[PDB]
Design a protein around this ligand. Structure first.
Ligand SMILES: Nc1ncnc2c1ncn2[C@@H]1O[C@H](COP(=O)(O)OP(=O)(O)OP(=O)(O)O)[C@@H](O)[C@H]1O
Ligand SMILES: Nc1ncnc2c1ncn2[C@@H]1O[C@H](COP(=O)(O)OP(=O)(O)O)[C@@H](O)[C@H]1O
Ligand SMILES: [Mg+2]
Lengths: 592, 91
């Protein structure tokens, strides 16, 4: 077996030395593999399956069963050798060196009849030999494989089996494929229980049953691009390594949750008292940037609290909101404040300007070009951003200004929490928060009465009439099935005088930051703030006229004074009021 | 890079399976200022000049605010290096 040991590895010998991990719950696959192996004409099984489902584990379990335990006749005391296929190619510069090695190995195998070959990554068997004068391994092996003179096992995934094996139909017909399916949750739990002993021995730690259950569940639920056994094993191994480096050591659920949260960024770690207190005061924290609009803040806080408390539906996004209201009331400001509260700032928001989706053929910007078209390899734009950041806030600004078909693509997002790009990959949306802003049904806020005679008048305030108008326009513009999937529809009322007075402080603070960027500052008196609030206030146009008034009445004078030289670094400006009645004006005084 | 990871490394799922991805995020402004403070010694030694703290702060802030085609740690260092070269050639 010297020639076999030179270009291969003895799996049965390794299994006799307990160098292979145990295999749990693969009796059916091993039985079918043995049944195919004990054939007469084409006894060559190939295991095709997704990467990480345990294809090599089946062969290792078969080797362990051969070494110890019961196997059917014609398989007693058979040596299973893994042919690396990389040593044969190496060192074969001269013509007819690979062929000589292959023929020698085959002759030895035929002489010593208790040999079973295992060739991992069988797709590499095609074209093993180089160009010029050389006979590839597949053509050499074809006659023996056809007649049943060489028992062999292969293992590939579906992609290269359909991509390489099926190209050579003649070689493909000599192998009987066996599907290896990804295990379910209890089977993964059993596998984790089996491997717990080895992983505890290696990491010198202790792992609880709840740790295994949590690892399996979290890996199944939150990781998308991998497969269950590998995900659970990776979680357990990384948690064990983290606890070992920290230093009897014990691994439990919260360590697994922390590891998963650090890996993916989705908040799943165990709730602490400080974080619970912070979540219970979400409205107060959000109101530091948004004045008024209490209902929308309550809705957002309720959604976030429900998501963090563990009562979220695991098949739908965290929340879906339609913020409908007039201009300049705080629809986008609330989204920016929510993003800043959540991650670290308003720059982490995923914002789409639906003014660019005016034509119905622009929807490809969400998916990507279909196969055979320019830009197909680039993929989608929204899908990639969501895939690279599973926990994020997605905002659709001015939804009514896009074609009323793009949102047909949001259905599966709002109900199944998933989206498929043109390449067939599924990207989940189950951890995102969807916000759609609009001003539909707000064109009649500055309306006094309706056409026709009427006694008395409408006792309902502007809020009720505008709410009814928004509901009617929403039903008119969108399909019933789209509106049936939206969690909340929040109507934004207009701002009052006190709200403007409060927003004055925030705007002045922003101006003060701009000035302090050049080592300066600005301070206003109460009379100045009251005058600014009185001058800029329009119930229809929101708080943008206040910004224009502030800029016109403050920034122009400040720029004129700075350019002239009265205001210089190291000085601050104090703004006061002079005059009375409608002749009141502002006065600026320098001060160190 | 993310684009190279998606375009090329994901065409071989078997190879991609055997790696654990780690996200390296773009540093914030204070982190960039600390990095500039750390590399000030080497850049002063190479360029044979002296750099003030205000120069580092201005470089970081201006690179973050005005230049938007690249990412923070590199584009901030580029301004310092260009200024050093411009000052060096004047001798
Ligand atoms: N409730 C508010 N609290 C604080 N500032 C506000 C509020 N509403 C408006 N503002 C100020 O007005 C600016 C413009 O408002 P914003 O961008 O939120 O409008 P919007 O409701 O999205 O309306 P539009 O329909 O024009 O997009 C904000 O950046 C902020 O400075
Ligand atoms: N039935 C099983 N019992 C125990 N462990 C398993 C089983 N199936 C897979 N594994 C584990 O999964 C890990 C990776 O599986 P692997 O053999 O790489 O699958 P593939 O060859 O299809 O990529 C291995 O370390 C193995 O321990
Ligand atoms: Mg807006």
């Amino acid at each position: 077996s010297l020639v076999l040991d030179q270009f291969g590895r003895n799996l049965t010998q390794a299994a006799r030395e307990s160098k292979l991990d145990p295999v749990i719950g693969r009796e059916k696959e091993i039985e079918r593999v043995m049944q195919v192996l004990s054939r007469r004409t084409k006894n060559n099984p190939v295991l095709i399956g997704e990467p990480g489902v345990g294809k090599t584990a089946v062969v290792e379990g078969l080797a362990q069963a051969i070494v110890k335990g019961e196997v059917p006749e014609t398989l007693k005391d058979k040596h299973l050798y893994t042919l690396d296929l990389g040593a044969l190619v190496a060192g074969s510069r001269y013509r007819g060196d690979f062929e000589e090695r292959l023929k020698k190995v085959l002759k030895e195998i035929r002489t010593r009849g208790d040999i079973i070959l295992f060739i991992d990554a069988l797709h590499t068997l095609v074209g093993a030999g180089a160009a010029e004068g050389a006979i590839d391994a597949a053509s050499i092996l074809k006659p023996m494989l056809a007649r049943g003179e060489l028992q062999t096992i292969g293992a590939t995934t579906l992609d290269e089996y359909r991509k390489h094996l099926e190209k050579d139909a003649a070689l493909e017909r000599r192998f009987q494929p066996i599907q290896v399916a990804e295990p379910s949750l209890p089977h993964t739990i059993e596998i984790l229980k089996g491997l717990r002993d080895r992983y505890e021995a290696h990491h010198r730690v202790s792992i609880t049953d709840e740790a295994l259950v949590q690892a399996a569940t979290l890996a199944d639920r939150y990781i998308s691009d991998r497969f269950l056994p590998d995900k659970a094993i990776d979680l357990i191994d990384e948690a064990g390594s983290r606890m070992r480096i920290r230093r009897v050591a014990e691994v439990d659920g919260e360590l697994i949750a922390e590891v998963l949260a650090t890996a993916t960024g989705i908040p799943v770690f165990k709730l602490t008292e400080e974080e619970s207190s912070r979540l219970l005061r979400m409205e107060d924290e959000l109101h530091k940037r948004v004045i008024g609009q209490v209902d929308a803040v309550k809705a957002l806080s309720k959604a976030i609290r429900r998501t963090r408390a563990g009562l979220k539906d695991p098949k739908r996004p965290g929340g879906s909101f339609i913020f409908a209201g007039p201009s300049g009331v705080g629809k986008t400001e609330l989204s920016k404040a929510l993003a800043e509260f959540l991650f670290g700032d308003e720059d982490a928001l995923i914002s789409l300007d639906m003014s660019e989706f005016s034509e119905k053929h622009t929807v490809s910007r969400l998916f990507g070009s279909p196969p055979g078209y320019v830009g197909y390899e680039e993929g989608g734009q929204l899908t990639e951003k969501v895939r690279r950041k599973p926990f994020s806030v997605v905002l659709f600004d001015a939804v009514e200004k896009a074609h009323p078909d793009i949102f047909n693509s949001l259905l599966q997002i709002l109900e199944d929490g998933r989206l498929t790009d043109s390449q067939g990959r599924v990207v989940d949306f189950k951890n995102t928060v969807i916000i759609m802003t609009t001003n539909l049904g707000t064109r009649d806020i500055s309306k006094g009465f309706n056409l026709g005679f009427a006694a008395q008048g409408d006792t309902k305030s502007n809020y009720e009439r505008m709410k009814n108008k928004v509901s009617d326009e929403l039903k008119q513009h969108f399909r019933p099935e789209f509106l049936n999937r939206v969690d909340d529809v929040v109507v934004f009322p207009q701002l009052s005088q006190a709200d403007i007075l409060k927003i004055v402080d925030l705007m002045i603070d922003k101006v003060d930051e701009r000035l302090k960027d050049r080592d300066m500052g600005i301070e206003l008196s109460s009379s100045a703030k009251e005058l600014l609030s009185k001058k800029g206030y329009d119930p229809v146009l929101g708080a943008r006229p206040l910004r224009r008034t502030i800029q016109r009445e403050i920034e122009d004078s400040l720029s004129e004074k700075i350019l002239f030289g009265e205001l210089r670094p190291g000085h601050i400006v104090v703004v006061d009021t002079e005059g009375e009645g409608e002749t009141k004006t502002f006065t600026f005084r320098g001060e160190e």
